[PDB]
Design a protein around this ligand. Structure first.
Ligand SMILES: CCCCCCCCCCCCCCCCCC(=O)OC[C@H](COP(=O)(O)OCCN)OC(=O)CCCCCCCCCCCCCCCCC
Ligand SMILES: CCCCCCCCCCCCCCCCCC(=O)OC[C@H](COP(=O)(O)OCCN)OC(=O)CCCCCCCCCCCCCCCCC
Ligand SMILES: CCCCCCCCCCCCCCCCCC(=O)OC[C@H](COP(=O)(O)OCCN)OC(=O)CCCCCCCCCCCCCCCCC
Ligand SMILES: CCCCCCCCCCCCCCCCCC(=O)OC[C@H](COP(=O)(O)OCCN)OC(=O)CCCCCCCCCCCCCCCCC
Ligand SMILES: CCCCCCCCCCCCCCCCCC(=O)OC[C@H](COP(=O)(O)OCCN)OC(=O)CCCCCCCCCCCCCCCCC
Ligand SMILES: CCCCCCCCCCCC(=O)OC[C@H](COP(=O)(O)OCC[N+](C)(C)C)OC(=O)CCCCCCCCCCC
Ligand SMILES: CCCCCCCCCCCC(=O)OC[C@H](COP(=O)(O)OCC[N+](C)(C)C)OC(=O)CCCCCCCCCCC
Ligand SMILES: CCCCCCCCCCCC(=O)OC[C@H](COP(=O)(O)OCC[N+](C)(C)C)OC(=O)CCCCCCCCCCC
Ligand SMILES: CCCCCCCCCCCC(=O)OC[C@H](COP(=O)(O)OCC[N+](C)(C)C)OC(=O)CCCCCCCCCCC
Lengths: 69, 247, 98, 49, 45, 77, 80, 105, 88, 132, 53
């Protein structure tokens, strides 16, 4: 068919149906990275998030409106 | 478009596809009916109430927009019928070698459509009370008390309006279907200069695209040219290098 | 996405038509935010919405007219809609998602 | 939507120019999650398609 | 002359493009959905 | 290096001309029509708006002292 | 079991129920059992049947109340 | 210029006006049965004036035939997708074949 | 299976389908790869362009005025169609 | 028909630069062979002084109808809706309300619409239900 | 393979993998439409009220 000039054109996204010979090996190295980070992102999400409707009770707000008055 | 081997997109080069790709046709059929707000579907339970609330506002603007919206519901029921017939029920326009080589697509391409079809049959009904519920707490959307007309939209509307979109929807659909099927000679519009002018205007999208480019964009680029000619290489060079060299 | 087939001349310019017309609204959206800082000194939801009634009616109009013009670009309403039908140069999945 | 709960992850501060303070804060109210169903659901099927 | 392609456009209206076939079941599963609906009257009543 | 560009004789004239428009420019009645608009007409028009409102816009924390909605209804019928 | 408009709530009651502003009216009292059930019923089209039906009829009477009170003003136009 | 009937170049002009005529009919008429009827007529309108031995008589028709097409031109002609103006024109052009001349920057 | 190419054999068997259904072909002078539209088959200037217009629709391409007038045989149609990227 | 876009000059004299009538390169026949097939230009062809406004990269030019005719059709179409909206407004053909606008208890929910005392009230109040 | 010259297009036989699926999918539509209609043809047209049982 046609020629991809693949000797030199090596963009990060491959180019023209690019697939490396050792693609099965690298994917498991990548599938770990997606799994490593998704698990990592779940930890931070639980630890660093909060509910912004329960930090202050209405009993505390009721003093704020009157104090500003 | 994937199935037809020529990968055409003009529905004037389609025809009689309903049996060679029955699965693709049904997805359009169920979706279009959901788009056209057939009773019991999902688009019905969301689009129809809006058309009522244009009239339920009982102001001048609500009345005028009511007909613009109602025409939109009408045209929706019309260009859908035009789209479905021209591509699935019409006399074939593509060559025969296309029809002998017309197949559906792989199972990976098929799965997403069927799943969206089911939502287009059941999604709207299940979710209706979550959003349109009478008094459901949704303070993220704030409605000032003097702007609530959901009560009068549902209780006070004339009994003929509640069916008006659908009656001109499918009832007007059949009439166009017959013309496209039995009496197509009416639509040979190139002979009629009134219809050709009308067809050209709306096919060219209100001539808005030509107005933008020929007038607005080019004038915007022209002001760049006049600044680039009479100012930057013009008066500033006269009161600059070229002018002072002459003096 | 719209100009994904960058070798195609039509897809290149239709991608530019989408970006420039949208940046028209984006300029108005920025101007709306500045009047939101000018009036309330904030762009938070918890703050600005808590002050809606107390603010001058003219000021809300200046902010929201800018929001409307920006929203006309993205939702492709009349006046800033020429790009919407030029967007079909992208692949069919792009049109479905966008 | 059903349990009347809200989530807010605040990564860090973005702008701190005198009174104008802006965070990299992400919240999920009823409306934010009312829009994440149409977005993520459709986009997942689009990618699968 | 007058339509020299008569024998060419024969198949655009014959075989699977006969008008009976073109509109044959254009409403997908009408009678299956219709047939089921009657049964729910039998099931409920 | 190796002159990796197929230089064009016509593009070079076009590039030569576009970078030397100052030479052929004249201060005819057309240029003054444009020059007046951009250097005087626009600056003065904006210069008036800038100075007219310079200090007349106390929009910081502006308050509302006038109702938005209407109270009583007066039907035509 | 609703046939006529019920008694209005009190100001303090709405605070504890956080009833939305646009629906703080005479029919607000029949809103609270409905809203509570929908939250426990996921706003489904079958888990709040009679509570929802009672409320819609309440808004009907609340709407039909204003119909008589709309015509009453229209007669006062005929005064002069 | 002048029009010389029965010359090869003059015939090709009439051939070109024929592709303009039938394609324009094809653009407006979207049913084959209706199209053949109108396409038959155009040829009859094209073949009735087949015999002309005069320059000036023929040039008026060329003036008229251009006007007939311009007023009847479709505002959205059908184009094959891979032909210029089509939906798939220039898509996925194979890259140019050429040697990379390295430069010592 | 997807669409299996378009080789000259399938091209030839479809052009003949055009001329067989076109009844303006002179009787006798069977459709042959060496035939001539005007000499053998018997078509005039306005007739040949009808065949060209039908041929370009059958193969879903657009033959420009420059090359359509160059095609004078049935083989030249086969060799012209085969040398195109959109002949489907 | 085949008209050139706006603001292209009729004449120009930039000294010794060649004079040539403007040609809208977007409208060249896409089937003819070119040295630069994408730009539809042949090598060493001269350029107009404003050739940047007359090529494939400039904004697309549409010549189906005259730029004046497009205004007539455009303004007429919205002009038609203007009379449809005007006559109803001038005639007052839109229907009257079938019920009184929705009223609200507790002084129109004045306090619940961000009011403090009874002096302002009407500033923040909704439609007052005076008919409890 | 070979192109058969001068033939009609017969009633195509696609795999009932696609045919049955489209029929069930379509049937799932209409059956739902009827099911809602019998229970909401009053309310849809406004001729009755939901609490008029
Ligand atoms: C930023 C502010 C932009 C400056 C506004 C001034 C616009 C202007 O004066 O442009 C002048 C031009 C009329 O002059 P012009 O068209 O160049 O005459 C040559 C005829 N062959 O006018 C135009 O070309 C169109 C002006 C449209 C302005 C919007
Ligand atoms: C952007 C912000 C501004 C930045 C720049 C600010 C300063 C710019 C000043 C611009 C003023 C000069 C520009 C216009 C003069 C151009 C000269 C010219 O065009 O030629 C006219 C003539 C030359 O004769 P000719 O060979 O025929 O050329 C004709 C070509 N049209 O020329 C003449 O006939 C002579 C004209 C009268 C000469 C009178 C001499 C009076 C004294 C000279 C002025 C001194 C200024 C400095 C003073 C302190 C110096 C120590
Ligand atoms: C207010 C006036 C706007 C001020 C700026 C004036 C525009 C200046 C020119 C911008 C640069 C133009 C450009 O980028 O190149 C041409 C590009 C191609 O677009 P196009 O030719 O239409 O592609 C068709 C493909 N079939 O053209 C474009 O895609 C540009 C897209 C439009 C640019 C935005 C202009 C604002 C439009 C406001 C419309 C609402 C008016 C109210
Ligand atoms: C204040 C600075 C005023 C300087 C005036 C310069 C304006 C000018 O250049 O006039 C045009 C003319 C140059 O010739 P040209 O460009 O061909 O004009 C075409 C007219 N049909 O100009 C001329 O022919 C003579 C202008 C030279 C005047 C220079 C004297 C300025 C000395 C004081 C500087 C301050
Ligand atoms: C499994 C899907 C859940 C089944 C729900 C069963 C159910 O009890 O709800 C019935 C519902 C339609 O019933 P509906 O008319 O809304 O109200 C009750 C009428 N007797 O039926 C459904 O919700 C069907 C949902 C799609 C299947
Ligand atoms: C919120 C921030 C998100 C950032 C994440 C970035 C993901 C995308 C990376 C693309 C890399 C790539 O591959 O682009 C390079 C691609 C590769 O082409 P190819 O398909 O590999 O084929 C290869 C053969 N070509 C090249 C002949 C087709 O070609 C290009 O030069 C395309 C033009 C430049 C694209 C610039 C995109 C940059 C992303 C936007 C940055 C804000
Ligand atoms: C208040 C604003 C102050 C801004 C700065 C001052 C103006 C800038 C002038 C640029 C000069 C220039 O361009 O010098 C270079 C220029 C000429 O150009 P060239 O390079 O030889 O090419 C162009 C030559 N041609 C025509 C052959 C192609 O030489 C001269 O004309 C020499 C005389 C210049 C005197 C400068 C006096 C400055 C006085 C300023 C107070 C009025
Ligand atoms: C790129 C190069 C740009 C150059 C910069 C130009 C900036 C111009 C400044 C505009 C100032 C302006 O508008 O001031 C306007 C003034 C005063 O107006 P008045 O008639 O007294 O107002 C009357 C007010 N009533 C009618 C409301 C009562 O006018 C002038 O007396 C101009 C003086 C400044 C220029 C010398
Ligand atoms: C196309 C051209 C615009 C359509 C025709 C408008 C004619 C007309 O009469 O439009 C006037 C209309 C109607 O509002 P009104 O009657 O002025 O006030 C009455 C308003 N109520 C009912 C709230 C009391 O308002 C507008 O301008 C609306 C904006 C139009 C889009 C710009």
């Amino acid at each position: 068919h046609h020629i991809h000039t693949p000797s030199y054109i090596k963009p990060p996204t491959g180019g023209w149906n690019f697939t490396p010979a050792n693609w099965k090996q690298n994917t498991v190295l990548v599938l770990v990275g997606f799994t490593a980070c998704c698990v990592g992102l779940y930890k931070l999400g639980e630890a660093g998030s909060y509910n912004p409707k329960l930090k202050y009770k209405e009993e505390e707000l009721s003093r704020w409106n009157q104090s500003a008055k | 478009i994937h199935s037809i081997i020529s990968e055409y997109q003009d529905i004037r080069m389609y025809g009689g596809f309903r049996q060679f790709i029955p699965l693709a046709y049904t997805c359009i059929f169920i979706a279009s009916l959901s788009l056209m707000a057939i009773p019991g579907l999902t688009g019905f339970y969301s689009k129809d109430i809006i058309i009522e609330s244009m009239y339920g506002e009982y102001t001048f603007s609500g009345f005028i927009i009511y007909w613009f919206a109602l025409i939109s519901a009408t045209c929706t029921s019309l260009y859908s019928i035009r789209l479905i017939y021209y591509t699935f029920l019409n006399n074939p326009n593509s060559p025969k070698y296309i029809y002998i080589n017309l197949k559906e697509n792989d199972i990976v391409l098929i799965t997403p459509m069927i799943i969206l079809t089911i939502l287009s049959i059941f999604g709207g009904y299940l979710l209706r009370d979550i959003y349109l519920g009478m008094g459901s707490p949704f303070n993220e959307l704030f409605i000032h008390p003097n702007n609530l007309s959901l009560i009068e939209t549902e209780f006070s509307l004339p009994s003929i309006l509640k069916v008006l979109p659908l009656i001109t929807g499918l009832g007007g659909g059949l009439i166009l279907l017959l013309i496209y099927e039995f009496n197509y000679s009416l639509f040979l519009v190139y002979n009629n200069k009134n219809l050709s002018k009308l067809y050209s205007f709306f096919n060219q999208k209100i001539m808005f695209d030509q107005l933008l480019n020929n007038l607005i964009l080019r004038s915007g680029l022209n002001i760049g040219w006049l600044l680039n000619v009479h100012i930057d290489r013009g008066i500033l060079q006269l009161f600059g290098p070229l002018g002072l060299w002459k003096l | 996405l719209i100009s994904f087939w960058f070798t195609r001349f039509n897809a290149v310019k239709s991608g530019l038509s989408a970006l420039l017309i949208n940046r028209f609204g984006d300029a108005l959206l920025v101007l709306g935010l500045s009047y939101l800082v000018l009036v309330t000194g904030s762009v938070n939801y918890n703050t600005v919405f808590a002050l809606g009634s107390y603010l001058d009616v003219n000021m809300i109009t200046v902010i929201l007219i800018c929001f409307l013009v920006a929203s006309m670009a993205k939702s492709a309403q009349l006046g800033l809609h020429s790009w919407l039908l030029l967007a079909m140069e992208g692949p069919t999945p792009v049109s479905s998602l966008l | 939507i059903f349990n009347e709960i809200e989530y807010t992850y605040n990564i860090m501060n973005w702008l701190n120019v005198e009174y104008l303070v802006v965070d990299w804060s992400f919240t999920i109210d009823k409306l934010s999650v009312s829009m994440l169903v149409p977005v993520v659901t459709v986009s997942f099927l689009v990618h699968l398609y | 002359a007058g339509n020299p392609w008569k024998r060419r456009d024969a198949w655009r209206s014959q075989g699977a493009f006969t008008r009976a076939n073109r509109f044959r079941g254009a409403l997908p599963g009408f009678f299956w959905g219709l047939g089921a609906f009657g049964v729910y009257c039998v099931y409920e009543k | 290096g190796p002159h990796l560009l197929r230089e064009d004789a016509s593009f070079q004239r076009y590039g030569q001309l576009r970078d030397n428009l100052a030479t052929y420019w004249k201060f005819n009645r057309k240029a003054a029509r444009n020059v007046f608009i951009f250097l005087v007409a626009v600056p003065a028009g904006l210069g008036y708006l800038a100075y007219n409102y310079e200090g007349k816009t106390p929009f910081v924390g502006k308050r509302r002292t006038e109702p938005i909605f209407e109270q009583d209804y007066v039907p035509r019928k | 079991g609703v046939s006529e408009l019920p008694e209005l709530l009190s100001h303090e009651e709405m605070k504890q129920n956080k009833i939305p502003l646009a629906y703080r009216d005479r029919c607000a009292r029949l809103l609270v059992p409905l809203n509570k059930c929908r939250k426990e019923g996921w706003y489904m089209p079958w888990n709040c049947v009679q509570e929802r039906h009672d409320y819609e009829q309440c808004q009907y009477l609340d709407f039909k109340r204003r119909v008589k009170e709309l015509e009453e003003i229209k007669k006062q136009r005929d005064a002069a | 210029k002048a029009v010389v009937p029965f010359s090869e170049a003059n015939k090709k002009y009439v051939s070109s006006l024929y592709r303009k005529s039938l394609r324009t009919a094809h653009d407006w008429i979207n049913k084959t049965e209706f199209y053949r009827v109108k396409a038959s007529e155009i040829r009859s309108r094209f073949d009735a004036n087949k015999h002309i031995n005069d320059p000036n008589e023929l040039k008026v028709i060329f003036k008229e035939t251009e006007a007939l097409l311009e007023d009847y031109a479709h505002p959205d002609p059908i184009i094959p997708p891979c032909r210029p103006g089509g939906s798939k024109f220039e898509r996925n052009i194979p890259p140019r074949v050429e040697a990379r001349i390295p430069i010592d920057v | 299976s997807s669409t299996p190419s378009l080789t000259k054999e399938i091209i030839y068997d479809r052009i003949v389908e055009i001329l067989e259904s076109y009844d303006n072909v002179k009787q006798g002078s069977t459709i042959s790869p060496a035939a001539s539209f005007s000499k053998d088959l018997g078509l005039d200037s306005l007739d040949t362009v009808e065949v060209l217009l039908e041929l370009e629709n059958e193969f879903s391409i657009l033959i420009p005025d420059n090359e359509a007038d160059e095609i004078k045989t049935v083989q030249q149609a086969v060799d012209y169609i085969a040398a195109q990227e959109d002949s489907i | 028909k085949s008209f050139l876009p706006h603001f292209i000059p009729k004449n120009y004299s930039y000294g010794d630069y060649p004079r040539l009538k403007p040609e809208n390169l977007q409208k060249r026949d896409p089937y003819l062979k070119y040295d630069d097939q994408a730009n539809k230009r042949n090598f060493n062809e001269p350029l107009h002084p404003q050739q940047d406004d007359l090529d494939m990269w400039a904004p697309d030019h549409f010549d189906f109808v005259q730029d004046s005719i497009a205004l007539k059709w455009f303004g007429t179409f919205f002009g038609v809706l203007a009379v449809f909206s005007s006559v109803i407004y001038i005639g007052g053909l839109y229907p009257e309300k079938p019920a009184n606008p929705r009223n609200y208890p507790f002084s129109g929910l004045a306090k619940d619409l961000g009011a403090s005392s009874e002096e302002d009230t009407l500033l923040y109040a909704a439609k007052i239900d005076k008919s409890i | 393979f070979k192109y058969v010259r001068g033939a009609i297009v017969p009633k195509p036989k696609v795999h009932p993998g696609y045919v049955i699926t489209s029929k069930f999918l379509g049937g799932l539509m209409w059956f739902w439409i009827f099911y809602r209609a019998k229970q909401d043809y009053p309310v849809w047209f406004g001729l009755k009220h939901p609490w008029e049982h």
